[PDB]
């Protein structure tokens, strides 16, 4: 029988995730039976169906009443309570909560779902404090089925970590720096306005906006040999989706661009198939909407100096690709459910 899933937070990730599940529903061990969100079912149904980035959902009918949303005649119960302690998880027999609000990323925060009755939580963001973090294709097999709260990290860490692993195994990464040139996200204001972070306050579609990021350090969680060896920053720019990681590493074994490319091409066809895609095409951000890989290496941009300083560039669809990984991680947990 199925693992019973509720989505907490029906936002860009919550709705991308839902759309990913609807496309892969026939082979799945997950059944999405509930959603909680600030908004009501009719608003959620409307936004699930009409998406400025994904287009109109055509695969099946989407409908709503006061209580439920219906996707292809699958009924999903809706509730709207900002306090996860109050949610009907025991009553709905919820096994796994997908925590996509961006608000309950600490153990104590996420545990509120457990005390409301869910058996496990998968947080769609980096965890705060001691929360086991997974990137599919890198360390997802180390998942321990006894764990009640996990994190699927960030979009950026999902893009960077698999490249780093391949490069580390082939060349030995000593140190590395990252910049993600990233689409704007919903934590940025539309026009200049009040915000705790003075950069996130500024008009998102009008500016290049630097922010600090934990994404590079977080690679050290999932590749423990590299802990404390990576750092970077983010630059948000006026696109609404699709991002790119720029990674410059100091490596031990001297190499050249051709060889770096070859090694990532070989991984994309074997150990990292479905996770890293290797491309020699001269494409731009739009072309990567809806791409299922965590990282698309842009081979033409790869360069090396003095044998040891390696630059690689990898695209990622930060909403859809990441949501596909969230789903992969959930399917994995369901296949390993004690």
């Amino acid at each position: 029988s199925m693992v019973r899933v509720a989505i907490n937070g029906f936002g860009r990730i919550g709705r991308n995730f839902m759309r990913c599940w609807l496309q892969r529903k026939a082979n799945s061990k997950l059944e999405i039976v509930g959603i909680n969100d600030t908004s009501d079912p009719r608003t959620n149904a409307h936004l699930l169906k009409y998406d400025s980035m994904l287009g109109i959902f055509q695969d099946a009918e989407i409908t709503a009443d006061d209580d439920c949303i219906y996707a292809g005649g699958h009924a999903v119960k809706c509730v709207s309570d900002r306090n996860p302690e109050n949610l009907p998880w025991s009553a709905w027999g919820i096994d796994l909560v997908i925590e996509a609000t961006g608000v309950f990323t600490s153990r104590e925060g996420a545990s509120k779902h457990l005390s409301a009755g869910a058996k496990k939580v998968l947080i769609t963001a980096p965890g705060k404090g001691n929360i086991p973090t997974y990137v599919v294709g890198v360390n997802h097999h180390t998942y321990d089925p006894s764990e009640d709260i996990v994190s699927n990290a960030s979009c950026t860490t999902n893009c960077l970590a698999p490249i780093v692993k391949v490069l580390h195994e082939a060349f030995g990464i000593q140190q590395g720096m990252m910049t993600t040139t990233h689409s704007y996200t919903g934590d940025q204001r539309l026009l200049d306005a009040s915000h705790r972070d003075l950069r996130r306050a500024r008009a998102a579609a009008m500016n290049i906006v630097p922010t600090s990021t934990g994404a590079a350090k977080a690679v050290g969680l999932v590749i423990p040999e590299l802990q404390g060896k990576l750092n970077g920053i983010a630059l948000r720019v006026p696109t609404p989706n699709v991002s790119v990681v720029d990674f410059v590493a100091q490596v031990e074994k001297p190499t050249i661009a051709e060889q770096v490319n070859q090694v990532i091409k070989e991984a994309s066809e074997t150990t990292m198939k479905g996770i890293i895609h290797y491309s020699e095409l001269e494409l731009v951000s739009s072309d990567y909407r809806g791409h299922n890989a965590s990282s698309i290496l842009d081979a033409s941009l790869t360069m090396v100096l003095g044998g040891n300083l390696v630059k690689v560039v990898a695209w990622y669809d930060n909403e859809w690709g990441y949501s596909q990984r969230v789903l992969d991680l959930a399917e994995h947990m369901a296949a390993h459910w004690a």
Partner: peptide
């Protein structure tokens, strides 16, 4: 100070959201 309090109480509010891109 009342602002820090407001973001503790309401971390999903527009003034408060911090997403780790």
């Amino acid at each position: 100070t009342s602002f820090q309090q407001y973001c503790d109480d309401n971390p999903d509010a527009a003034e408060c959201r911090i997403y780790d891109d």
